[PDB]
Amino acid sequence: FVIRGDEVRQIAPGQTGKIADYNYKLPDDFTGCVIAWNSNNLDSKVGG
Amino acid sequence: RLDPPEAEVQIDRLITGRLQSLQTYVTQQLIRAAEIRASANLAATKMSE
C-alpha cells in the first residue's frame, strides 16, 4: 500500500496512531521485515 | 495507565518479584517442615520409650 511519508514509523509493531489503530494494525509479536520508500515522483500528481 | 508493550514490561517485573517471594516462602516452609519433622520423630520416640 501507500501511506503518508511521516506516518511510516507509525507502522511499527505495537504502535499507536490513526493508521495503526484504524486501517492496518500489526501484532505485538510481529516477525518479519518492513520496507518503505518515497514514491513522490511516481504517485504524487502535479494536479494532486 | 500504560499500553500493551510497557504494561507487559512492568507486569513482567512484578511477576518476577512475586515469583521470587513465593519461592523464598516455600523454601523457608520446607526447612521449617524439616525441623518440625525432626521434632515430631523425637516426640514419637519419647512416647514409645
Swiss-Prot record, chain A:
Protein's name in the database: Spike protein S1
Function: Attaches the virion to the cell membrane by interacting with host receptor, initiating the infection. The major receptor is host ACE2. When S2/S2' has been cleaved, binding to the receptor triggers direct fusion at the cell membrane. When S2/S2' has not been cleaved, binding to the receptor results in internalization of the virus by endocytosis using host TFRC and GRM2 and leading to fusion of the virion membrane with the host endosomal membrane. Alternatively, may use NRP1/NRP2 and integrin as entry receptors.
Residues included from the entire protein: 400 to 447 of 1273
Lineage: Viruses, Riboviria, Orthornavirae, Pisuviricota, Pisoniviricetes
Renumbered residue ranges of the record's region Integrin-binding motif: 4-6
Annotated phenotype, changing residue 6 to N: In strain: Omicron/BA.2, Omicron/BA.2.12.1, Omicron/BA.2.75, Omicron/BA.4, Omicron/BA.5, Omicron/BQ.1.1, Omicron/XBB.1.5, Omicron/EG.5.1; complete loss of interaction with host integrins
Effect caused by changing residue 18 to N: In strain: Beta/B.1.351, Omicron/BA.1, Omicron/BA.2, Omicron/BA.2.12.1, Omicron/BA.2.75, Omicron/BA.4, Omicron/BA.5, Omicron/BQ.1.1, Omicron/XBB.1.5, Omicron/EG.5.1; May enhance affinity to human ACE2 receptor
Organism whose genome encodes this protein: Severe acute respiratory syndrome coronavirus 2
Subunit structure: Binds to host ACE2. RBD also interacts with the N-linked glycan on 'Asn-90' of ACE2. Cleavage of S generates a polybasic C-terminal sequence on S1 that binds to host Neuropilin-1 (NRP1) and Neuropilin-2 (NRP2) receptors. Interacts with host integrin alpha-5/beta-1 (ITGA5:ITGB1) and with ACE2 in complex with integrin alpha-5/beta-1 (ITGA5:ITGB1). May interact via cytoplasmic c-terminus with M protein. May interact (via N-terminus) with host bilirubin and biliverdin, thereby preventing antibody binding to the SARS-CoV-2 spike NTD via an allosteric mechanism.
